[PDB]
Amino acid sequence: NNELLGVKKLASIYRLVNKYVDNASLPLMAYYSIARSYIGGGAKTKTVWSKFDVYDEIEFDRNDFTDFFQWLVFLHNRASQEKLSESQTTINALFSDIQSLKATLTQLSASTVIKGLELSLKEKLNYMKSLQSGEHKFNNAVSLYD
Amino acid sequence: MNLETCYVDFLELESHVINEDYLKESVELQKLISTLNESKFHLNKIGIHDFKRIRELQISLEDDLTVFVGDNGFGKSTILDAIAIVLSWLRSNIEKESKPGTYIKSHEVNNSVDVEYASIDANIKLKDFNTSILITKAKEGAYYSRNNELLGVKKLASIYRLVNKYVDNASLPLMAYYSIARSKTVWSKFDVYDEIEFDRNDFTDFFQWLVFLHNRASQEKLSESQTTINALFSDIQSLKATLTQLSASTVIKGLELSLKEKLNYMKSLQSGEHKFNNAVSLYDSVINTILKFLPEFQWIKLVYGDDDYKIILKKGEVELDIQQLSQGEKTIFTLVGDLARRLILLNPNLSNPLLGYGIVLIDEIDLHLHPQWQQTIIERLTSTFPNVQFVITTHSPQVLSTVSSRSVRILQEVEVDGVNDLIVSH
Amino acid sequence: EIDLHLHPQWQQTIIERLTSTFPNVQFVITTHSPQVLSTVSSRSVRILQE
Amino acid sequence: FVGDNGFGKSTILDAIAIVLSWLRSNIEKESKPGTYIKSHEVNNSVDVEYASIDANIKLKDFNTSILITKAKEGAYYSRNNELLGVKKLASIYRLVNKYVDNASLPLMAYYSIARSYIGGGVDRKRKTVWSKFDVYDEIEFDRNDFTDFFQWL
Amino acid sequence: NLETCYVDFLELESHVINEDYLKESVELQKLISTLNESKFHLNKIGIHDFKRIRELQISLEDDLTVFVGDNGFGKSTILDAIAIVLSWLRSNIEKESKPGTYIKSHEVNNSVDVEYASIDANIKLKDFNTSILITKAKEGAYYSRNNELLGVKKLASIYRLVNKYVDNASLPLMAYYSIARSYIGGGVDRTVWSKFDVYDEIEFDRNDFTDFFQWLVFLHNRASQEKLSESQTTINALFSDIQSLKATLTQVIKGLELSLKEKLNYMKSLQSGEHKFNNAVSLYDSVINTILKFLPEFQWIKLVYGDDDYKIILKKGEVELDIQQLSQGEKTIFTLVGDLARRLILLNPNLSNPLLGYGIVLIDEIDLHLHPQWQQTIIERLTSTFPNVQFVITTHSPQVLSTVSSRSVRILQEVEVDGVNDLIVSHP
Numbered sequence A: 001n002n003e004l005l006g007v008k009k010l011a012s013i014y015r016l017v018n019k020y021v022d023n024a025s026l027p028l029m030a031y032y033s034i035a036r037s038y039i040g041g042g043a044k045t046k047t048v049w050s051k052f053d054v055y056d057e058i059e060f061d062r063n064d065f066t067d068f069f070q071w072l073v074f075l076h077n078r079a080s081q082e083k084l085s086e087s088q089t090t091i092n093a094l095f096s097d098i099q100s101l102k103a104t105l106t107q108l109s110a111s112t113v114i115k116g117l118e119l120s121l122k123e124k125l126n127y128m129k130s131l132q133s134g135e136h137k138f139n140n141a142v143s144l145y146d
Numbered sequence B: 001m002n003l004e005t006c007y008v009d010f011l012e013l014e015s016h017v018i019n020e021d022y023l024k025e026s027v028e029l030q031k032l033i034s035t036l037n038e039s040k041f042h043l044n045k046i047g048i049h050d051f052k053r054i055r056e057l058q059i060s061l062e063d064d065l066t067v068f069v070g071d072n073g074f075g076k077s078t079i080l081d082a083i084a085i086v087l088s089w090l091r092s093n094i095e096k097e098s099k100p101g102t103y104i105k106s107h108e109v110n111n112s113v114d115v116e117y118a119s120i121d122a123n124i125k126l127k128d129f130n131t132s133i134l135i136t137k138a139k140e141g142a143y144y145s146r147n148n149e150l151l152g153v154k155k156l157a158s159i160y161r162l163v164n165k166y167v168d169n170a171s172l173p174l175m176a177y178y179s180i181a182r183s184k185t186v187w188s189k190f191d192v193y194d195e196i197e198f199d200r201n202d203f204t205d206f207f208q209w210l211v212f213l214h215n216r217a218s219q220e221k222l223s224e225s226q227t228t229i230n231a232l233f234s235d236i237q238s239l240k241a242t243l244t245q246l247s248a249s250t251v252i253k254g255l256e257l258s259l260k261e262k263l264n265y266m267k268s269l270q271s272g273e274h275k276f277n278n279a280v281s282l283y284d285s286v287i288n289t290i291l292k293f294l295p296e297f298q299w300i301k302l303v304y305g306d307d308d309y310k311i312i313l314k315k316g317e318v319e320l321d322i323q324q325l326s327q328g329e330k331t332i333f334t335l336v337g338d339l340a341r342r343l344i345l346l347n348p349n350l351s352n353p354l355l356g357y358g359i360v361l362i363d364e365i366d367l368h369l370h371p372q373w374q375q376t377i378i379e380r381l382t383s384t385f386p387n388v389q390f391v392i393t394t395h396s397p398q399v400l401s402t403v404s405s406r407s408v409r410i411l412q413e414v415e416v417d418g419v420n421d422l423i424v425s426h
Numbered sequence C: 001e002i003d004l005h006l007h008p009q010w011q012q013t014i015i016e017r018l019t020s021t022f023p024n025v026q027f028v029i030t031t032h033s034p035q036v037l038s039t040v041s042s043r044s045v046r047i048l049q050e
Numbered sequence D: 001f002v003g004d005n006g007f008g009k010s011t012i013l014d015a016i017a018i019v020l021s022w023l024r025s026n027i028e029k030e031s032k033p034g035t036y037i038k039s040h041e042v043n044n045s046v047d048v049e050y051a052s053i054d055a056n057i058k059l060k061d062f063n064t065s066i067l068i069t070k071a072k073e074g075a076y077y078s079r080n081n082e083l084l085g086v087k088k089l090a091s092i093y094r095l096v097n098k099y100v101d102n103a104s105l106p107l108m109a110y111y112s113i114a115r116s117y118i119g120g121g122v123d124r125k126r127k128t129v130w131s132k133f134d135v136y137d138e139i140e141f142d143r144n145d146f147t148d149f150f151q152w153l
Numbered sequence E: 001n002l003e004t005c006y007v008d009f010l011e012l013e014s015h016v017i018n019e020d021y022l023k024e025s026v027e028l029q030k031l032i033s034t035l036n037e038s039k040f041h042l043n044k045i046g047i048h049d050f051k052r053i054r055e056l057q058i059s060l061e062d063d064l065t066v067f068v069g070d071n072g073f074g075k076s077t078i079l080d081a082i083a084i085v086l087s088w089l090r091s092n093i094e095k096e097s098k099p100g101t102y103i104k105s106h107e108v109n110n111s112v113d114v115e116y117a118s119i120d121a122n123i124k125l126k127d128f129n130t131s132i133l134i135t136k137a138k139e140g141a142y143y144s145r146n147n148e149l150l151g152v153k154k155l156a157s158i159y160r161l162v163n164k165y166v167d168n169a170s171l172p173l174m175a176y177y178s179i180a181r182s183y184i185g186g187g188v189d190r191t192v193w194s195k196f197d198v199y200d201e202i203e204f205d206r207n208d209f210t211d212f213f214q215w216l217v218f219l220h221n222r223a224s225q226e227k228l229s230e231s232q233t234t235i236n237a238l239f240s241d242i243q244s245l246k247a248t249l250t251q252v253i254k255g256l257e258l259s260l261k262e263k264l265n266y267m268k269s270l271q272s273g274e275h276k277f278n279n280a281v282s283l284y285d286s287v288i289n290t291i292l293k294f295l296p297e298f299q300w301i302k303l304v305y306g307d308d309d310y311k312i313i314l315k316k317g318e319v320e321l322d323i324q325q326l327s328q329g330e331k332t333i334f335t336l337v338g339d340l341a342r343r344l345i346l347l348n349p350n351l352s353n354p355l356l357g358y359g360i361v362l363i364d365e366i367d368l369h370l371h372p373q374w375q376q377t378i379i380e381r382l383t384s385t386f387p388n389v390q391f392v393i394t395t396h397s398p399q400v401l402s403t404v405s406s407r408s409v410r411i412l413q414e415v416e417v418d419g420v421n422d423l424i425v426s427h428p
């Protein structure tokens, strides 16, 4: 017969930790056999993505390429949503402030216009940067896709 | 002015004349278009001769509503199939010349031993023009009345075709039929199919169509449109920085620069296709139409979460998923959504494409409908679309109460001389 | 969906015939229209509320 | 079951259908499996960790109870169904048919809302020894049932 | 000249009767001798605006040509073009006016200037010559010119006319081994008697080897009965089997009729009646000894009957091995060599040594799953064992290149001329 006490004890620690941690990580195991050349460029609207779908099998074979394409386009749409909305509002200010500064640079430099342009640009840039989409890298989206 | 006289004059002038640019500039084309727009496609009379359960009937329809009431086994759905049969020949002729329509199957003829042939007749009138269509099919060992007299129906197709051949983004009649279970072009552009038959309770396909359209609209909102927007935005600030914001040959140079920027923006906007048919206009027009149909909601949107995506509806102070709706609201949702999509794609010139012309046939409007919906569905339907005909069959008495007496028909088929025959009462 | 494609005349008699042709079979039915509801008694109706 | 609500009346009916599915399978042969609860129907709220359905069958004075349960993926504790009552009940049915002959077995049927399409296929839609277990194969009405009906007639 | 003989024979046959005399006429003997002396050869081929290639002219040697290049230099394009050209000839031989493969829409060059793609080829047979052209325009363009197919039809009609008079006519071999040679152990761990099974309907690529297993079973069965005797009156026994099958059928029906026909075919053993030097046992020995040359480690290969089934048993060192338990490297060689010998042994039923026919073989990436020691001797072994065949192979490993003669190698380069990179060929 087999010996299985150690691996069951180790697996229980991972399950217990995952029970009390929101975003606990897991180890990675993979295997690329000699049958990966068949998938060289040879699903009911999948919607929910979880970290337990990569534990279906230890071997990469056949359909894993198709799910990769489905996953990739989902990331692209997520980035598009992040690219729109309120990020455009600060973008609208920033270019205009730069344009205003450029205008202040022109017309033989006209304080007054220069002071107003500098103050508005500094205030808007500082306010936009302060939020930084919560915690900067926490926004992911564009950074993961790039 | 008579439509036939204008058509004759325009055709004669166009045929004799050359230099097509001048032919387009000719006032005859404008007169024909103006007369054509001032019209209302509506049927007038229908005659049935030995079709299934009925052998002789002359029915006259209204122009707003025509509800037929009765029980199972009274010819309620044969009238609708007769109108669909008549309509299909007109659609086939419109698409291509001498295109066969839909024939009559052998089993549909009456099983009486003394029957010889089955015929259907119809009369479509618009403004002052009139038309007549007659289809015949003899069973066996007899002689069907003359033949398929489709000479009149070809003139209407020619009239529409001539106008559509010269002036783009024209208007076409609407033909839709929501049947029972049974079972290049703008339509081929996005996803749509060209057919008369449509099926309800197809929420999955409409849901995926909406998702794909939203993706394409978001894709087209970026890229080149950003440049024009960016060009406008700086210019708006720059124009203010000289006159408005500045006041809480330098002047000539500034004015010339502003005028040049305005001219460049106008040239860029003019370059390229107009509003016409784009993903953004189709998406927000369909969404707005559905919001008009059900004012109990506030907004609907598609949200991409951290590990999934869905559609969110706001009602009161509660956000509900598209999958939390009952079976009752799914069918009305897809019914109005498809009706609006087909109406938008057919009238690319009207400011409000919800004022088109056509005919819609609905059978058993009470399917999976809660009685509260049944109380006001007919009121909402004729209010959102005020320039279309509706031919609807009613089964339950809940709906019938609201309808006005002017447009009610009751089937109480008597046996005249010991022979069953459908009779309509007012 | 007991009341699919039935006119009101047929809706008031379907329960009697089902409970008379097969008297020893337990039946579970979901209804939608008042015509069916009126015929049934009060000890056999369960109302679900949010 | 009157009174509309968001949760949907159909879910109750198929919940009963899951419970009933285990009895026939055990009747056909001992320890035969049935219909499991799929992991994609457990509630998505973060609070929950497992789902369960239970019911009781009374036969005169005999009383049997059955519980069917399934936990979410990655849960600390695992849950299993208890089938002692159903297996015991199915044993007497098996023995009766094994000794006596021409015995009768309980009827379980379920007519969904799709019968309109299947029943409507009357138009074209185009065995000798009718045994007892032929009907003891499915619980949901289908097109092939009517096709079998015509041949039986 | 072949044309003169064909013209004379056609004229004589058209104005004659009594086919028996026509068969015995000197025309058939002269045509057969002339055809036999002829050797298959494909001297040149030109490619125009196909895939990356924009303009190329290639001449191929008589015995062996090797193309070497990096990744993305068009090695597979050349082989695909040759397979396309050979398809029309195969189709016309098998069935009159049978269409072949076309050129797909996306094969043409992606540039905006190119409007069409074309492949030209020339086949030299002793002194007779022929030319083939296949063309395909782009999508949405005018001047949709057509391709010429008179040469292939002229060549094919000679073959069918010769094969009509004599039922033992030989045919050329055309095969193509692609990358799809891999997967499911090549063919491992996934009757055959007609000469048209390997040819005609069967394409150029490879799908499975189960027919090799059944063919070997049939070879062994005839080997024991004919060469080793142990059958007494085999013709009488098979005829009695046919009679028994008919009696059983008289007192599932289609299967019984097929079994009766099979029994009649087996009863035709005395009808054949050759018992020559090229008997079943001689073919069995030649096939096994041929295979063993490419696998020096093994000792013997045998077919074992047990549990109402047949299995292949190999000897390595002192351990017995099955077929599923081998490695991928020895599986590739076993499959390739076995199918190569199966086609020659099956399309040349009259040669004393049937591994002496004529044909052309295309191999891509011969160095798949082979250690360098095996790579240093595969080419000379294949050349030595199949002398009268033409080989076209591609490689990118320097070990394979180091053992090839200087007159058989071709080197591909990417040279940018006038701002546009164009593929070029060269010799050392």
Ligand SMILES: Nc1ncnc2c1ncn2[C@@H]1O[C@H](COP(=O)(O)OP(=O)(O)OP(=O)(O)O)[C@@H](O)[C@H]1O
Binding pocket: B052, B053, B071, B072, B073, B074, B075, B076, B077, B078, B107, B108, B109, B110, B111, B112, B180, B363, B393
């Ligand atoms: N060939 C025929 N000859 C005579 N009667 C026919 C024939 N075909 C059909 N019928 C009659 O048609 C009747 C049903 O017609 P129909 O489909 O219009 O009914 P309905 O109840 O109004 O339909 P629905 O539920 O689709 O609205 C049957 O009662 C049958 O007697």
Ligand SMILES: Nc1ncnc2c1ncn2[C@@H]1O[C@H](COP(=O)(O)OP(=O)(O)OP(=O)(O)O)[C@@H](O)[C@H]1O
Binding pocket: E051, E052, E070, E071, E072, E073, E074, E075, E076, E077, E106, E107, E108, E109, E110, E111, E364
């Ligand atoms: N339609 C096309 N237009 C432009 N370039 C193309 C086109 N089709 C293919 N190519 C180019 O051809 C190059 C060579 O492809 P090819 O398949 O011939 O490579 P190979 O090295 O010969 O292959 P293998 O490894 O299978 O022997 C590719 O890198 C690709 O960029």
